[PDB]
Amino acid sequence: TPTPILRFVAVGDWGGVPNAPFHTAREMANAKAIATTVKTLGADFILSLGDNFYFTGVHDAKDKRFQETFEDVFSDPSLRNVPWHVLAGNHDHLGNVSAQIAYSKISKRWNFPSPYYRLRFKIPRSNVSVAIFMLDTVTLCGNSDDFVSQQPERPRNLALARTQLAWIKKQLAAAKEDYVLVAGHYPVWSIAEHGPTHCLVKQLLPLLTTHKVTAYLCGHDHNLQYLQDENGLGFVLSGAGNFMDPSKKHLRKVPNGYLRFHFGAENSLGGFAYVEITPKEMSVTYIEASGKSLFKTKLPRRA
Ligand SMILES: *[C@@H]1O[C@H](CO)[C@@H](O[C@@H]2O[C@H](CO)[C@@H](O)[C@H](O)[C@H]2NC(C)=O)[C@H](O)[C@H]1NC(C)=O
Ligand SMILES: [Fe+3]
Ligand SMILES: [Fe+3]
Ligand code: NA
């Protein structure tokens, strides 16, 4: 009988441009590649890994950019009723992030109830559950655009950062699901221009290790990377919806052997990741906007 499966696309840093035509050729190519993937292989939902609207987000919930950069761009019929689950990046927080949360009630497929939140999924016709914790790494660690270094040196509100961290610790300690995923804009590990996010390495990584998280999904660096540590924890970096950056500036800031796949060709149109979860395993497939498949690897069921 048909294998039970939950499928989703994880695209990051897709948020167009504030000048006409409010998209890039890369966003357009990825919206069409995503449509082909959902049409042929299927998607239960799409996960945005932040930087939803370059370069200063939206002003309010009626901002025209919602139509120009998001709705009209991802408009192939095959994407019509695919829910999106959203989190925010640094450029979103240069603007009005409550506007993006409030847009949840304007557009059906846009789901973004709060800066951070938990998603729960059962795989159909199985007892296998999936948990996804959507983080706001900007309020946890600070806006990278607030610093010349562009590395978030500290959060702007101590109570918020502490509150969200206590929330993560609690949720992760009690999460009994078969696969547990954590997502946020900033990378834990990354070999590229931004590199590892010290705040997440020091505060988030230990929790991911203690509670046996399946994978951490992120964007922020504008390319595609798979990383994996000695404990089997996977790092899915998908930040190539709009830009492609071949930098390897931080290659030796990531522990030796972590990097398992990297693609950042400056002339590529970008890409995204395709996650398939069965009772057997979780698979991640990196797909170039050219429709090409670049890399596939598997992560085991937890506890
Ligand atoms: C941030 O955005 C929120 C969401 O739009 C703003 O609150 C709304 O402001 C709009 C202005 O276009 C009003 O028309 C709405 O009535 C408000 N929301 C609702 C649900 O009624 C908020 O003012 C913005 N904060 C800023 C710009 O500092
Ligand atoms: Fe970005
Ligand atoms: Fe970013
Ligand atoms: Na909605």
From Swiss-Prot:
Keyword annotations for this protein? Answer: Disulfide bond, Glycoprotein, Hydrolase, Ion transport, Iron, Iron transport, Metal-binding, Secreted, Signal, Transport
**EC category name:** hydrolase
Return the Gene3D superfamilies for the record. Answer: 3.60.21.10
Coiled coil regions, renumbered to chain: none
Source domain of life is: Eukaryota
Listed as disulfide-bonded, the cysteine pairs are 141-199
Family matches, as SUPFAM superfamilies: Metallo-dependent phosphatases
Question: Where, in this chain's numbering, is Fe cation 2 bound?
Answer: 51, 90, 185, 220
> What cofactor is needed?
Fe cation
InterPro entries associated with the record: Acid_PPase (IPR024927), Calcineurin-like_PHP_ApaH (IPR004843), Metallo-depent_PP-like (IPR029052), Metallophosphoesterase_PAP (IPR051558)
Q: What is this protein called?
A: Tartrate-resistant acid phosphatase type 5
